[PDB]
């Protein structure tokens, strides 16, 4: 009758639907796609932001920008890391979600946050110039 103790809640989702709902229009933010967002799905959003607001414009190159190029796993993760880094530097909030899980389809609860954070940055007209490079060079 009373089962749970999982994590992925409806709240963490309602936050993303609005977080990205504004910054970007497509793809459509659905409780489903928001919980089972494929490496590809997210890719669209990430890029969209750079085309919508511009945030992290110098983060990805012509190659990276094109998901097609990305095929190997090791890459999928390395691609997400770039953003995950900046987003954190800009927003200023430590994230746990790993790019090795979301890419597969796990630890969705957290994934939602990652998107919520990014949206905020743009919402507050917060651009990224230093962070972008920092991660690019691999600073710490």
From Swiss-Prot:
Where is it made, tissue-wise? Ubiquitous.
Q: Where in the cell is it found?
A: Cytoplasm, Cytoskeleton; Cell projection, Cilium; Cytoplasm, Cytoskeleton, Cilium axoneme; Cytoplasm, Cytoskeleton, Cilium basal body
UniProt function note: Plays an inhibitory role on IL13 signaling by binding to IL13RA1. Involved in suppression of IL13-induced STAT6 phosphorylation, transcriptional activity and DNA-binding. Recruits TRAF3 and DISC1 to the microtubules. Involved in kidney development and epithelial morphogenesis. Involved in the regulation of microtubule cytoskeleton organization. Is a negative regulator of microtubule stability, acting through the control of MAP4 levels. Involved in ciliogenesis.
Pathology noted in the record is: Senior-Loken syndrome 9: A renal-retinal disorder characterized by progressive wasting of the filtering unit of the kidney (nephronophthisis), with or without medullary cystic renal disease, and progressive eye disease. Typically this disorder becomes apparent during the first year of life.
Q: Which family does it belong to?
A: Belongs to the TRAF3IP1 family.
Under the subunit heading, UniProt states: Component of the IFT complex B, at least composed of IFT20, IFT22, IFT25, IFT27, IFT46, IFT52, TRAF3IP1/IFT54, IFT57, IFT74, IFT80, IFT81, and IFT88. Interacts with IFT88. Interacts with IL13RA1. Binds to microtubules, TRAF3 and DISC1. Interacts with MAP4.
What protein name applies here? TRAF3-interacting protein 1
* Gene behind this protein: TRAF3IP1
List the range of the whole protein covered here.
1 to 133 of 691
């Amino acid at each position: 009758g009373s089962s749970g103790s999982s994590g992925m809640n409806a709240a963490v989702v309602r936050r993303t639907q609005e977080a990205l709902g504004k910054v970007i229009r497509r793809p459509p933010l659905t409780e489903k796609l928001l919980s089972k967002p494929p490496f590809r799905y997210l890719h669209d959003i990430i890029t969209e932001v750079i085309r919508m607001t511009g945030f992290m414009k110098g983060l990805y190159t012509d190659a990276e920008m094109k998901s097609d190029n990305v095929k190997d796993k090791d890459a999928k993760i390395s691609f997400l890391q770039k953003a995950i880094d900046v987003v954190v530097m800009v927003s200023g909030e430590p994230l746990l979600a790993k790019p090795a899980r979301i890419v597969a389809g796990h630890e969705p609860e957290r994934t939602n946050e990652l998107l919520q954070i990014i949206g905020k940055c743009c919402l507050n007209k917060l651009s990224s110039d230093d962070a972008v490079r920092r991660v690019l060079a691999g600073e710490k």
